[PDB]
Protein backbone atom coordinates (compact mmCIF):
# COMPACT_ATOMS: atom_id res chain seq x y z
CA UNK A 1 0.00 0.00 0.00
CA UNK A 2 2.81 2.41 0.87
CA UNK A 3 4.51 1.60 -2.44
CA UNK A 4 1.34 2.06 -4.51
CA UNK A 5 0.67 5.40 -2.82
CA UNK A 6 3.75 7.01 -4.38
CA UNK A 7 2.49 6.33 -7.90
CA UNK A 8 -1.01 7.84 -7.50
CA UNK A 9 -1.05 10.67 -4.94
CA UNK A 10 -2.27 14.21 -5.46
CA UNK A 11 0.55 15.88 -3.48
CA UNK A 12 -1.58 18.90 -2.62
CA UNK A 13 1.51 21.00 -1.83
CA UNK A 14 2.41 20.97 -5.52
CA UNK A 15 -1.11 20.96 -6.94
CA UNK A 16 -2.32 24.09 -5.14
CA UNK A 17 0.82 25.88 -6.34
CA UNK A 18 0.20 24.77 -9.92
CA UNK A 19 -3.41 25.94 -9.62
CA UNK A 20 -2.38 29.35 -8.28
CA UNK A 21 0.17 29.74 -11.08
CA UNK A 22 -2.47 28.85 -13.66
CA UNK A 23 -4.97 31.33 -12.21
CA UNK A 24 -2.38 34.12 -12.17
CA UNK A 25 -1.31 33.39 -15.74
CA UNK A 26 -4.94 33.31 -16.90
CA UNK A 27 -5.77 36.66 -15.31
CA UNK A 28 -2.60 38.17 -16.78
CA UNK A 29 -3.44 36.77 -20.21
CA UNK A 30 -6.97 38.16 -20.07
CA UNK A 31 -5.59 41.54 -19.02
CA UNK A 32 -3.04 41.72 -21.83
CA UNK A 33 -5.63 40.44 -24.31
CA UNK A 34 -8.12 43.15 -23.38
CA UNK A 35 -5.26 45.64 -23.61
CA UNK A 36 -4.12 44.36 -27.02
CA UNK A 37 -7.58 44.76 -28.56
CA UNK A 38 -7.25 48.55 -28.37
CA UNK A 39 -4.22 48.51 -30.69
CA UNK A 40 -6.15 48.41 -34.02
CA UNK A 41 -8.32 51.29 -32.75
CA UNK A 42 -5.81 54.10 -33.36
CA UNK A 43 -6.44 54.02 -37.13
CA UNK A 44 -9.51 56.24 -36.72
CA UNK A 45 -7.16 58.95 -35.45
CA UNK A 46 -5.41 58.89 -38.83
CA UNK A 47 -8.73 58.71 -40.67
CA UNK A 48 -10.12 62.04 -39.44
CA UNK B 1 -0.88 50.99 -36.34
CA UNK B 2 -1.05 49.58 -39.87
CA UNK B 3 -3.20 46.41 -39.94
CA UNK B 4 -6.62 45.69 -38.46
CA UNK B 5 -7.68 42.71 -40.60
CA UNK B 6 -5.62 40.40 -38.35
CA UNK B 7 -4.35 41.07 -34.82
CA UNK B 8 -1.70 38.37 -34.53
CA UNK B 9 -0.87 39.54 -31.01
CA UNK B 10 -4.40 38.60 -29.96
CA UNK B 11 -3.92 35.20 -31.59
CA UNK B 12 -0.72 34.48 -29.65
CA UNK B 13 -2.42 35.67 -26.47
CA UNK B 14 -5.29 33.27 -27.16
CA UNK B 15 -2.87 30.38 -27.67
CA UNK B 16 -1.08 31.12 -24.40
CA UNK B 17 -4.41 31.39 -22.56
CA UNK B 18 -5.49 28.05 -24.05
CA UNK B 19 -2.35 26.24 -22.91
CA UNK B 20 -2.65 27.78 -19.46
CA UNK B 21 -6.31 26.81 -19.19
CA UNK B 22 -5.42 23.23 -20.11
CA UNK B 23 -2.88 23.22 -17.28
CA UNK B 24 -5.48 24.78 -14.97
CA UNK B 25 -8.06 22.13 -15.84
CA UNK B 26 -5.56 19.37 -15.12
CA UNK B 27 -4.66 20.93 -11.76
CA UNK B 28 -8.30 21.50 -10.75
CA UNK B 29 -9.22 17.93 -11.66
CA UNK B 30 -6.32 16.41 -9.74
CA UNK B 31 -7.09 18.70 -6.79
CA UNK B 32 -10.81 17.97 -6.51
CA UNK B 33 -10.04 14.28 -6.99
CA UNK B 34 -7.89 12.34 -4.55
CA UNK B 35 -5.85 10.58 -7.22
CA UNK B 36 -2.93 11.67 -9.38
CA UNK B 37 -3.64 9.29 -12.27
CA UNK B 38 -7.32 10.21 -12.78
CA UNK B 39 -8.41 8.08 -15.74
CA UNK B 40 -4.97 8.02 -17.23
CA UNK B 41 -5.03 10.57 -19.92
CA UNK B 42 -1.67 10.87 -18.14
CA UNK B 43 1.07 8.21 -18.15
CA UNK B 44 -0.07 4.65 -18.79
CA UNK B 45 2.71 2.74 -17.02
CA UNK B 46 1.67 4.27 -13.71
CA UNK B 47 -1.92 3.05 -13.82
CA UNK B 48 -0.79 -0.28 -15.27
CA UNK B 49 1.38 -0.80 -12.19
CA UNK C 1 0.64 17.27 4.82
CA UNK C 2 0.96 16.18 1.20
CA UNK C 3 -1.18 13.05 0.72
CA UNK C 4 -4.77 12.34 1.76
CA UNK C 5 -5.72 9.42 -0.52
CA UNK C 6 -3.74 7.04 1.70
CA UNK C 7 -2.39 7.58 5.22
CA UNK C 8 0.49 5.16 5.80
CA UNK C 9 1.27 6.34 9.34
CA UNK C 10 -2.19 5.49 10.64
CA UNK C 11 -2.02 2.19 8.76
CA UNK C 12 1.23 1.02 10.36
CA UNK C 13 -0.05 2.26 13.72
CA UNK C 14 -3.10 0.04 13.21
CA UNK C 15 -0.77 -2.85 12.41
CA UNK C 16 1.17 -2.26 15.63
CA UNK C 17 -2.03 -2.15 17.68
CA UNK C 18 -3.24 -5.37 16.03
CA UNK C 19 0.07 -7.05 16.87
CA UNK C 20 -0.24 -5.92 20.50
CA UNK C 21 -3.83 -7.15 20.80
CA UNK C 22 -2.71 -10.76 20.32
CA UNK C 23 -0.30 -10.62 23.26
CA UNK C 24 -2.92 -8.81 25.34
CA UNK C 25 -5.54 -11.48 24.64
CA UNK C 26 -3.11 -14.33 25.32
CA UNK C 27 -2.05 -12.75 28.62
CA UNK C 28 -5.63 -12.13 29.77
CA UNK C 29 -6.69 -15.65 28.81
CA UNK C 30 -3.74 -17.26 30.60
CA UNK C 31 -4.53 -15.06 33.61
CA UNK C 32 -8.19 -16.08 33.71
CA UNK C 33 -7.26 -19.74 33.20
CA UNK C 34 -5.06 -21.53 35.70
CA UNK C 35 -2.84 -23.26 33.15
CA UNK C 36 -0.08 -21.85 30.95
CA UNK C 37 -0.49 -24.36 28.11
CA UNK C 38 -4.25 -23.76 27.85
CA UNK C 39 -5.34 -25.72 24.78
CA UNK C 40 -1.93 -25.58 23.19
CA UNK C 41 -2.07 -23.11 20.42
CA UNK C 42 1.25 -22.68 22.25
CA UNK C 43 3.95 -25.37 22.30
CA UNK C 44 2.55 -28.86 21.72
CA UNK C 45 5.47 -30.93 23.00
CA UNK C 46 4.77 -29.58 26.48
CA UNK C 47 1.12 -30.54 26.09
CA UNK C 48 2.07 -34.11 25.18
CA UNK C 49 4.44 -34.35 28.14
Long-range contacts, B34-42 (Cβ 8 Å, 24+): B34/A10, B34/C4, B34/C5, B35/A8, B35/A9, B35/A10, B35/C5, B36/A7, B36/A8, B36/A9, B36/A10, B36/A11, B37/A7, B37/A8
Residues of A in contact with B4 (CB under 8 A): 40, 43
Q: Cβ contacts of residue C15 below 8 Å, gap of 6+? A: none
The runs of H, that is alpha helices, within C1-49 are: 8-32, 45-48
Question: Do A11 and B36 meet the contact criterion of CB atoms below 8 Å apart?
Answer: yes
Partners of residue B35 in chain C, C-beta under 8 Å: 5
- Could you say which DSSP state residue A42 is in? G
Instruction: Indicate yes or no: CB of A7 within 8 angstroms of CB of B46.
Output: yes
Partner A contacted by C49 (CB < 8 A): no
Specify the experimental method.
cryo-EM
Give resolution in angstroms.
3.4
The whole-angstrom distance between residue B26's C-alpha and the CA centroid of its chain comes to 7
Amino acid sequence: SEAQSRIQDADYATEVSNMSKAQIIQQAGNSVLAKANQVPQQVLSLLQ
Amino acid sequence: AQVINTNSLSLITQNNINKNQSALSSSIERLSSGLRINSAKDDAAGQAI
